[PDB]
Design a binder for these strands. Sequence first.
DNA 1: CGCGCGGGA
DNA 2: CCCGCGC
Length: 872
Amino acid sequence: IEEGKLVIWINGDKGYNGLAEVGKKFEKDTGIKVTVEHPDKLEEKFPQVAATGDGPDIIFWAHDRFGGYAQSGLLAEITPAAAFQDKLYPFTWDAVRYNGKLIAYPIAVEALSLIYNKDLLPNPPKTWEEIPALDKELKAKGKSALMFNLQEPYFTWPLIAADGGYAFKYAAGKYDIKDVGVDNAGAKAGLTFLVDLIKNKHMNADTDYSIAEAAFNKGETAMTINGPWAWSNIDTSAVNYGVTVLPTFKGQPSKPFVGVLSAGINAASPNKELAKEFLENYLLTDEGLEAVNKDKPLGAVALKSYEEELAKDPRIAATMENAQKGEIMPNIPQMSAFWYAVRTAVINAASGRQTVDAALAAAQTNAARAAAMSVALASEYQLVQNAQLPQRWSQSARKSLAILEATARKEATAQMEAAGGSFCGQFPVDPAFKVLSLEYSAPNPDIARAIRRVDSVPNPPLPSHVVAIQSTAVDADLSLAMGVSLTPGRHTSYLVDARALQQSNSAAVAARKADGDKWGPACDEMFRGCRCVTGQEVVFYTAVKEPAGSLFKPSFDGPAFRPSWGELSGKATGVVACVLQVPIGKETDIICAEYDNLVSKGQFATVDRFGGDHTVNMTGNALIQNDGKAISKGYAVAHRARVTSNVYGKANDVSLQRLAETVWSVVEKRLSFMPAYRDLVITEQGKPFMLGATATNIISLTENQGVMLHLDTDDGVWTIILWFHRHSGIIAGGEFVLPSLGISFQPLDFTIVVFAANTIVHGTRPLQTTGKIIRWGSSHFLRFKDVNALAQLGAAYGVDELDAKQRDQLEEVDAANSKDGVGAARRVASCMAAERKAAIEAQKAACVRGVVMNPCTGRMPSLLFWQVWRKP
DNA sequence: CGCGCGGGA
DNA sequence: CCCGCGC
Ligand SMILES: [Fe+2]
């Protein structure tokens, strides 16, 4: 977020052009440009981006999400004068309080109303109790009294809550998540009346949003229940309609949930007073709100002065009436526990699968349990983010390791003297040069060997935010504190300022976008500034300066070591990237052999990534839910091979585990933090769906492919990429590029990079080849959605039962196809999918997890094992 | 192989 | 919409 400016995020279904006009008028009076954007997946995008201290200055969303944001410290406290607060209705301010603090400005107010056909029903009923008799009349006329969405409890809750239901008890400025109001007599009475309506055929238990909307807008039912978003559609129809107070139940008003569109201020915003002034003096005025409202209607409004104007529309007046008789929707993330439990209870009670009493008894206890576990997982997440490696660092160990490293440097120097230079395998390594193309030979059936630098330029210098560590003492400090043990005397360590790293990340994605999401001139310009580390073994540590926001979340209350280097004091270090050079031998034989076995046996699924950026082959423990009949680990070819093999059903599973474990073993010898990361993030329920004793569940494979610069947001904390070559020839380009670290390299005999793929922008330049040479690239990574879904399937059916279910589902689908054709087989699979989906959601509702994940971002931590350094 | 159908959200 | 799947 740039100082002296305002950027606003607001959903696409809003009046952003009108809002942009208010910005226009604001820029005119102040000189401060206001840019209005409507990103996709806005509800998810804001907490993900603001968690890194970036994103908009102002966010527009339903107030209920803003309590979760406040828990995460994403929002600035709002400080309106009492004179300003008087201009908005008092209950709208209650909607934007968290822990006694105002956290947003209310804008608009929405709630469900009763919508009725004036021609079928000139005087709509005041009571729910009237509706049975009224439906008898209209049934005689070939019509019905009432149709509304019965599938979503947002819609049925106003009746259920009328006589006493509630979500969480509110008291002393806080919701008590132990106190759920789902199982009291009021709730029971309301749901009973609802199910009696279905029991007496006045409503259909299958009625959903689309069925009700179509029936009301076609003149077939006299009433529906909907919000202001539905008025447009009714306005295109022939129906003469009104909007009024919801019916009472037992003389009490129906209690719809109230949603308040609100404007929050990013805690990481340099422009908080500019934001406050724009919101208080430009938007929250009649002129302001009208400009927005003319673009797309706001519905009811929080500003008393404009609401008095709008309320001349009786539909708006009714909205505010229903809203004032309703309950503000609780603004805490545990509402998800509430929603799932009540949705289940209403569906079961409407289908007779449970009595009303059993349905609500179980929703009550289930919602409370899920909300409690939700809290417990949030606190556990803080422990994993702040976890520390087993301590091997000390001042004595530092110094001894510094001696051994200094000895190894002399020995490597002497060995370089005796050989005439530095070599990685057979490849001559000279850091004075950048390796732009190079030759490989294939003298035998082993892997092709990198032999000769072909095209080069002088090697660009390191960027200024990246520093090679010269001191063996500092080398030993970081090695012992971070669980990195690179080849003695034959590696280079680097320190990278965390703030510049983040700026450079953003510049790299800016360049990729400007190029049209490809390697074009802007990405090339950055590549020309990257320093080649081809043939080197290196590690990059980032240093986060103690806040006296950010992408990185070190705990500066954790234990502190004394650095030999004074400049680390007041900072935390983490490992962002490491490049290894694996000596060809037994391990490389095993790995290459498994790739060959899996290719020959057709076990890779071929997919396209990033539109048509490149082609990628995948294997591993996927769960492809797009495949309706998938109910076990692996791609569809893997499911099939277990049944169709006439030798050994698990053969490809053995191959995959050896492949992941062998790559993992090679990496773990150098990076002892890797098994610590595995042990920390993989749950007991996730472990059977990893590949062996690793943090890998998915493995990719690419053949002479470039890849645009990007981040892998849905993967683990660290990712492993390797390359190996087949056949001889010359490759130009194809470098792996880490532009925010300012480095690139050509993979040689068997280069491996281990890096934080969710937070370091990276990519592979396109390549050109001469001869038959093939560069095979492969990522081993954690794709957490698959392990979560599989862990959930495991909890629902039993881990070992998945193969049996998978075999049965394959057989039942083949049978249908062979008997009744392709369309029948697709119908069997769709049925399987909905059965699978229901089971997964139930386990997901029970907080069953394969991996630990950030509750705020829905992703894995940006880094782990931060080490604080302090030198008094 | 292409392009259909498909799930989840 | 997308590091699937099957006609
Ligand atoms: Fe990647």
